[PDB]
């Protein structure tokens, strides 16, 4: 019936002055735009069909053509920024917001989807959707005593669209918009559907990706324990954003970092720091690096939880980007830790994997490692045991690495090179 229409036939039916002919042509456009391989979005745009689709959104007496045109516009808006802009330029934003209150749930859901694609394009369209007033009717769709009574796909779509309203910086979303959305986000973060949980965590990860004032808005909602619980989920689509959110929070103040430790997050990191998925291991080590940049009592928690052997592990063997994060964790540890804590680090075997990474070509990781070596020597000075550390470094080939590094191309590495040899290797 409406399968495999040409764009020319779609235009002919939509321009026909016959509502039923228009409906059949709009459904044909929807099916074209819903095929798997290369939907002809630009062809549909170039035919000038977007204004007619937008006008069809307002035909209350023919809900099928509202649905079909909403679906068609949703899939155009799913494309490039240009293609999303064409949908916005046709006036679709207020028309879709009007459809959020439709009595037909499948039309309301289509409008939710369309607004998620538009807001998802970037901060400008995100903020434009907010200025048109989308947040109030979106949140009203979730104003039920128990989310479990909502259709599963309906709830997943609303969660995803709400997360796109929280997404992107330069600029971050308006503060009042974030405050209005957060209580619903907290409710969705306690729902029992894995996809809702994943997109709820992504939303929280967006809101915590910013300055400490943005992190505080989230932490003050009391969500850190739930985030730590989701840190231990079996589903990788949940662990990934949960870890991102936790890692974002520990870039804030020592007090915000303490909430993460208080909630029991460190107990999950034996698993995370050995996780077979490279990205989880990398972001878990990044998170560890920002915790070891904290107070000495927070470094002590890392010690108590047995996590220093795991840092030695990732330093000894991991993806290089993970090893670079491990080097940062070590340098931050040695920069803020006590003499005892630094001594414990050497006793766990940090020296040899540290020296082995001095063969890397990433100039920054060499600077990071050389800083850590200096910090450990400074602790060994307070104990008078610098000669013991010098023996450790030369016995594992580290001296040969530093003594060949004074001729490096970067100069802050050559200065750090020679300074270590003049003081401790002569």
């Amino acid at each position: 019936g409406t399968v495999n229409w040409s764009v020319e036939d779609i235009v002919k039916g939509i321009n026909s002055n016959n509502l039923e002919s228009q409906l059949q042509a709009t459904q044909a456009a929807r099916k074209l735009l819903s095929r798997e391989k290369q939907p002809p979005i630009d062809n549909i745009i170039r035919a000038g069909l977007i204004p007619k689709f937008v006008s069809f959104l307002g035909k209350t007496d023919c809900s099928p053509i509202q649905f079909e045109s909403a679906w068609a516009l949703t899939n155009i808006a799913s494309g490039t920024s240009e293609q999303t802009k064409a949908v916005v330029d046709g006036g679709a934003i207020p028309a879709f917001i009007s459809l959020l209150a439709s009595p037909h749930a499948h039309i309301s859901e289509q409008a939710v989807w369309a607004l998620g694609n538009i807001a998802g394009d970037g901060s400008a369209f995100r903020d434009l959707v907010i200025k048109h007033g989308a947040i109030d009717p979106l949140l009203a769709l979730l104003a039920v005593p128990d989310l479990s009574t909502l259709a599963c796909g309906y709830l997943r779509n609303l969660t995803w669209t709400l997360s796109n309203l929280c997404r992107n910086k330069n600029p971050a979303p308006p503060l009042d918009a974030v405050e209005q959305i957060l209580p619903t986000l907290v409710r969705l973060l306690h729902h029992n559907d894995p996809e809702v949980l994943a997109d709820s965590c992504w939303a929280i990860s967006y809101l915590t990706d910013g300055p400490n004032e943005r992190i505080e808005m989230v932490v003050k909602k009391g969500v850190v324990p739930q985030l730590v619980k989701l840190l231990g989920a079996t589903e990788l689509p949940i662990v990934t954003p949960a870890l991102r959110a936790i890692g974002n929070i520990v870039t804030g103040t020592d007090e915000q970092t303490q909430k993460v430790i208080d909630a029991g997050a460190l107990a999950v990191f034996p698993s995370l720091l050995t996780n077979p998925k490279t990205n989880i291991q990398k972001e878990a080590t990044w998170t560890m690096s920002n915790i070891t940049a904290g107070r000495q009592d927070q470094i002590q928690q890392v010690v108590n939880h047995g996590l220093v052997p795991f840092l030695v592990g990732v330093l000894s063997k991991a993806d290089f980007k993970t090893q670079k994060e491990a080097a940062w964790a070590i340098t931050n540890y040695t920069s803020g830790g006590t003499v005892e804590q630094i001594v414990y680090l050497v006793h766990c075997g940090i020296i040899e994997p540290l020296m082995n990474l001095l063969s890397a070509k990433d100039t920054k990781i060499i600077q990071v490692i050389l800083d850590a070596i200096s910090n450990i020597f400074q602790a060994a000075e307070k104990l008078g045991e610098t000669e013991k550390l010098s023996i450790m470094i030369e016995e594992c080939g580290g001296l040969d690495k530093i003594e060949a590094l004074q001729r490096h191309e970067n100069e802050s590495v050559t200065k750090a090179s020679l300074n270590l040899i003049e003081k401790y290797f002569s």
């Binding site: 798997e36 939907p39 949703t74 899939n75 808006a77 494309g79 998620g116 694609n117 998802g120 796109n164």
Partner: peptide, 7 residues
Amino acid sequence: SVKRRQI
């Protein structure tokens, strides 16, 4: 991307 096409 964070956009979704409905199939």
